[PDB]
Amino acid sequence: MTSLEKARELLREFPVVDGHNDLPWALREQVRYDLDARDIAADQSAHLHTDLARLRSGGVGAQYWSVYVRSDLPGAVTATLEQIDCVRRLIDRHPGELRAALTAADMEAARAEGRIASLMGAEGGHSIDNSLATLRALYALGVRYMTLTHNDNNAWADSATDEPGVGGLSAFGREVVREMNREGMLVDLSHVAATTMRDALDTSTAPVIFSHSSSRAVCDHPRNIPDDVLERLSANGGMAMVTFVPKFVLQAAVDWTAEADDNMRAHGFHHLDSSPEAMKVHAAFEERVPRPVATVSTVADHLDHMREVAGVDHLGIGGDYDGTPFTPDGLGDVSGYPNLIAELLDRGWSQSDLAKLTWKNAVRVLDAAEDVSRGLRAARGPSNATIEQLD
Ligand SMILES: [Cl-]
Ligand SMILES: [Zn+2]
Numbered sequence: 001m002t003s004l005e006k007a008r009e010l011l012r013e014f015p016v017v018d019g020h021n022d023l024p025w026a027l028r029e030q031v032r033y034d035l036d037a038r039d040i041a042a043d044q045s046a047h048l049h050t051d052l053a054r055l056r057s058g059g060v061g062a063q064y065w066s067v068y069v070r071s072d073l074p075g076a077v078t079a080t081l082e083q084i085d086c087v088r089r090l091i092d093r094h095p096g097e098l099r100a101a102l103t104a105a106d107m108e109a110a111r112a113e114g115r116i117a118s119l120m121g122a123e124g125g126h127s128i129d130n131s132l133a134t135l136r137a138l139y140a141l142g143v144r145y146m147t148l149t150h151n152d153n154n155a156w157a158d159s160a161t162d163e164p165g166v167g168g169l170s171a172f173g174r175e176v177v178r179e180m181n182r183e184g185m186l187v188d189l190s191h192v193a194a195t196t197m198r199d200a201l202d203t204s205t206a207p208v209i210f211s212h213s214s215s216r217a218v219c220d221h222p223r224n225i226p227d228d229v230l231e232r233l234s235a236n237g238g239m240a241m242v243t244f245v246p247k248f249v250l251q252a253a254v255d256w257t258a259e260a261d262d263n264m265r266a267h268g269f270h271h272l273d274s275s276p277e278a279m280k281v282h283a284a285f286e287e288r289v290p291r292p293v294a295t296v297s298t299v300a301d302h303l304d305h306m307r308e309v310a311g312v313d314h315l316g317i318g319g320d321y322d323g324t325p326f327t328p329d330g331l332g333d334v335s336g337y338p339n340l341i342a343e344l345l346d347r348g349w350s351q352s353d354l355a356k357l358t359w360k361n362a363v364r365v366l367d368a369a370e371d372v373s374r375g376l377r378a379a380r381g382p383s384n385a386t387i388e389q390l391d
């Protein structure tokens with residue numbers, strides 16, 4: 001059989017545990033949670049990267065649904081609760097295809113039943129409003145990982161796409177990591193600055209993750225992971241879940257985006273300006289300079305290097321589907337995973353290597369978080385420290 005056929009066979013036994021899908025945010029923005037207007041039990045290819053049929057075709061066996069909310073707007077806690085509610089509604093609306101999962105055991109139970117284990121991950125520390133009790137509430141509601149920052153710094157952690165702030169994690173930031181360790185919530189280092197990554201690794205007593213980040217050595221961009229950080233994963237026991245975002249993984253895309261941003265500023269616009277005037281300027285740029293397109297090979301290049309530095313037991317996949325408008329050819333939506341697995345097979349990756357990449361590493365890491373939590377919960381009570389006290 002072909003590598004693609006083999007890939008599908010392998011995925012049927014050990015499916016993909018995707019680390020980060022922003023479907024909830026897409027539903028919030030596109031139809032304000034009017035789920036009937038974007039019923040994932042139907043074909044949503046015209047509007048979204050995600051729907052049930054494509055998840056099945058893609059071999060996805062577990063999904064960490066992101067409950068991301070904007071950090072530049074007030075009411076982040078309320079919005080996060082609405083995002084969590086959206087995930088719960090999706091699970092309740094499609095019991096035949098989805099199963100809520102809070103533990104590693106739940107993930108295996110879902111796999112045995114043929115249902116997609118549905119977990120939740122908060123994206124950005126602003127979701128807890130500098131409140132440790134709020135962090136605990138999110139865990140109680142089912143959140144199993146929290147990206148310490150999104151694109152902007154928060155009061156206690158520095159983002160990779162912002163200027164230096166506290167220098168990584170502040171004293172309160174370390175307290176947040178300690179509490180996440182006690183609760184059993186995975187510390188997610190995607191989006192954070194390299195300084196923050198190192199501070200988190202120094203502090204965490206549990207394996208950490210990168211729900212959607214690739215290799216900085218392969219493609220120099222702050223959203224990717226430096227080799228020195230990848231090297232620490234074996235000792236920490238965590239894992240880096242490679243992402244597909246073109247402007248992060250393809251060198252030509254990183255350069256193109258930088259030039260596009262410069263062009264925007266050349267016209268007196270902030271590179272993030274979305275006004276009709278700004279859009280006209282950007283359209284003109286893309287007209288004379290076509291947008292580079294990434295491929296499955298691009299992503300495989302990252303995984304090859306990540307495997308070399310971090311080790312096969314410390315890798316995963318986090319597509320960032322419905323969180324980014326652009327995708328690599330061959331990975332246009334959630335049905336594309338088999339193409340990546342096929343490419344890796346062609347590159348010599350073994351069946352066991354791939355089972356770790358797709359399923360086993362993720363289950364091991366969540367189980368580890370639970371194990372560390374058992375020890376810490378029995379050793380001490382929860383923290384009631386405030387950011388004022390520590391910072
Ligand atoms: Cl992202
Ligand atoms: Zn993200």
Ligand SMILES: [Zn+2]
Binds near residue numbers: 020021022066320323
């Ligand atoms: Zn996201």
